[PDB]
Ligand binder design. Structure first.
Ligand SMILES: [Cl-]
Ligand SMILES: [Cl-]
Ligand SMILES: [Cl-]
Ligand SMILES: [Cl-]
Ligand SMILES: [Cl-]
Ligand SMILES: [Cl-]
Ligand SMILES: [Cl-]
Ligand SMILES: [Cl-]
Ligand SMILES: [Cl-]
Ligand SMILES: [Cl-]
Ligand SMILES: [Cl-]
Ligand SMILES: [Cl-]
Lengths: 216, 216, 216, 216, 216, 216
């Protein structure tokens, strides 16, 4: 990564942490914040290191390559590289493959990120990767938020855990996820607790709803 | 975080420590000082990293979003952002969502915290999070301090452990918690030790009370 | 803590070490040097972090609050805070609660410790905490040094281990602990080894005493 | 390694990580990105350290020496070292054995990497090693991509895992591996899922193919 | 400790390492180099930290206090502290208790070690501690080098292991330990190997002796 | 060690790593690169620390002292120390015992290594130690390369593993080890694979030989 702006190699324990996350949790949503966390300030090289060091799950990793290539091609469409000799004071325009690290050196990557104005290929490439990771997480979720229904004897606290766990993996904008909260959570509760929450106004927060069905 | 004031990414072992705390202890009161401890000097990004990396407990994490939004809206009410072009020497006013990190970049967050005078969005956001964590801890306590009663054969030392453990999770100002100490601890002791403490003046410290019921 | 004088947050592995010490050893005397060791250069905030992160043992932790308050009130008696506007070049006088960290910010704490002359609230507060920890260790010792008596078949080496272990937890000045060494150790040995040591002059060191009863 | 450009010794936990990788995973493809990751900025000495610290697998390690020697001899052919006294302001031309670290000191290696223009013997030698590691990985793969055939009841997700795992270890340019993707993956699927994918156009991505055979 | 000369607190993992050494190995000779290793550059405070954090083995730790006091009193005899006001440019003369850390502050200890000329109380105190540790190691050795005799079927390699293990814990100058090597090792070998070594000249090295009795 | 050139103490985890290597692997060849790796930039003091912290294996450690003394005496023969007062601008000539660390201080060792021109007692002493370690490794190998013979049903890959493992511990120059490769490996293969390799020209690499006997 790059700290403060002095270059540093990806640490052994960053690597080990990332490797273990995928080993332990496969593609559960929280893997992604962890990914971003362990790659704070990461170069494309550091980002590529993390992806290639994943053993197994190679159907997903292949999917991730495809998504990244789609984003790379789109970058090239909007940002066409121009023909000409790169003058002494400047550095060349990055293509999608330079951003994904496959066709650029670390020094070029260090150059782009540090030059003023900053051209943050690290944060750009990270978005393409995270974009592709969501496609995987969302695909690898077996259940839909529509299927989360409260069991007749399930403590509300546990039903809300399943709902917002499954919700976290859905492909939905904030407004669609907002709609699912205001509609389905109460809609799919079991009759006894469903009634209790209905008596609460139709704009009450989860705290009021959870404490309401705590005894029931 | 930010040390001394040079920016640094949240460390692998900070992350791992925070993850393990929630895995091991759920929402026991001590999780919160640990949270604050592991987030000393944390940016909103670092704070958001920690929250999103929590797997499970998503009913609480949803509650935490709601509390944070309440505090954010309140910030916007008192601090309305003004319309105008941000002059070269200055930086824009932060909204609640900039403080919660959802709508601000790391550089803006670094800018606000370091600019003089300091605008500590990190310490502000941390208070909103801790505010929301208390609501969770307090809700997730099964027992009330009123229900902690000394068993007939329970060593006082163990009864006081249960009392101040349960007390730690109560929603109460210092004065209310002071009242509970001076009233309930002795009130709810078992007859044999209850009598012994009554003979002590009614302003004696826990040391005098614990050593008093040590034999009994 | 503060190193060399640049501020630093309490480290994850300091925290983990302190947490584990209390988990593993409760309040055995050695916990206290460990405490001081892990808090070298600690601010009141860092000191408070360590105390609050202790789960369980809340009867003792409550006792520790009371001791700290006694020391704080005494500080206020000798050092009364004066009324007046704090001039630009100076910083305010710390109260007991500022030293205990409950009513002071980190920057004020950094200010006091670094300003010349140094006002070491960290080392002051640490003494109050250690004072309160001794009250706990000493209270939580089941046995008195007076009760350590050598068994008829106990190797002297093991009897001396029990004596100076139990001695370490006693409330006694160095002179009283010196008296206990010169009186009780030999006094409470078993007849066979007791005689052997009596033949040695009455000012011989533990090395001479231990090697004397090695065969017996 | 060399950071930012200040020399540093290979860390204990780098060493331990590399040792454990070979112990746990033998020569699975991901060992290689890990190798490159743990050797970021590595000198030939640091690279040699990692190779020699491998216990066992000495048939492969011998193969690795042979590959490195082939690359070294080729370096000497294109870059013949010239006879003459090395002038005060300059440093000598590196041979293949200087690049492989066997005949050069750390200071000469530090000199070459830091001198301007940079002569990156570390990154050169690393390529020879990685070249030799691929020969090993590829040789030590038992299966060919041609032999990966979907079982009649195997979930497509698992068949694609085996395909791209085995593909990762193949000796093939990107174009040959591209051909294998577009030809064999669908060709070697089982009849039921093979048909389903055939109905999709013949240019659809893995995401479309995997989601297509998810029910079947 | 003090690095390069900037002060640093004793690290958590130094502490943990030292604690574990005594837990695992009691007072086997190698504990002592470890002690010196973990205390490289240690202040008396850092040295005292390590000693006090030892739980158990308190008969030895008491012995260690006594040895340290003997060395301290001897220091005071040769270096008597003089009466007078310490001038502005100077610092006071250290007593034995200042060197042992019991009566000196860290700053005084930092002052003495860094002032020119250097007054290394750390390295002085460390010698007193190591002096006292040897008395313990040597006392706690059950066996004498005189009692190490080769068993009739013991491989020489194992007999030499026992000899130089037991030798390491003996109270003997280098010349006395040299005499024990040249005399007892061969003297106390078993008849078959004893004869074999006797045929070798009486000045042959352990390598020649060990390889000589390898078959027998 | 010394980094970049600023002095540093040997790290806890270096120590622990070295201790564990000897515990786990005794004197297998790879211990030696590990030794060199963990002692990169090591002073004689740091080198002595590592040797003395080895518990057990004291027959070998004694052998190591003897080898080091032989190399030390040889140093003294070629480099006789001269009589005279060491002038203010200079430092004394190191003897063998100063290089082995037994008769020199850390500062003298820091002085020699840093003074220009550099007098690298660390790298000199390390060679003496490594010299002595090879004598141990080679002695402690039970088998000779001559005795490694392929079993009738042993996969060639496993026979080559045993050959180059055992070869690694042999006392032989590169030319003698080259001869053993070109002669014995094929000579001592089993009849079926021995024939197969004979059909290959008599200058084919291990890759060609291993892939040749892969089916057989
Ligand atoms: Cl994210
Ligand atoms: Cl990629
Ligand atoms: Cl807090
Ligand atoms: Cl949030
Ligand atoms: Cl203490
Ligand atoms: Cl407190
Ligand atoms: Cl690679
Ligand atoms: Cl090599
Ligand atoms: Cl030593
Ligand atoms: Cl002491
Ligand atoms: Cl080596
Ligand atoms: Cl030595």
């Amino acid at each position: 990564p790059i700290v403060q702006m002095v270059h540093q190699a990806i640490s052994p324990r960053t690597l080990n942490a990332w490797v273990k996350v995928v080993e332990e949790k496969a593609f559960s949503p929280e893997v992604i914040p962890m990914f971003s966390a362990l790659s704070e300030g990461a170069t494309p090289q550091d980002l590529n290191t993390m992806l290639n060091t994943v053993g197994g799950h190679q159907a997903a990793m292949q999917m991730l390559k495809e998504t990244i290539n789609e984003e790379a091609a789109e970058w090239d469409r909007l940002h066409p590289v121009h023909a000409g000799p790169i003058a002494p004071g400047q550095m060349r325009e990055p293509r999608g493959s330079d951003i994904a690290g496959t066709t650029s050196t670390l020094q070029e990557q260090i150059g782009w990120m540090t030059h003023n104005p900053p051209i943050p290929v690290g944060e750009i490439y990270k978005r393409w990767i995270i974009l592709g990771l969501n496609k995987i997480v969302r695909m690898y979720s077996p259940t839909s938020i529509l299927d989360i229904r409260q069991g007749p004897k399930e403590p509300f606290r546990d039903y809300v855990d399943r709902f917002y766990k499954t919700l976290r993996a859905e492909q939905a904008s904030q407004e669609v996820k907002n709609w699912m909260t205001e509609t389905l959570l109460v809609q799919n509760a079991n009759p006894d607790c469903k009634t209790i929450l209905k008596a609460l106004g139709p704009g009450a927060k989860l705290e009021e709803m959870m404490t309401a069905c705590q005894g029931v």
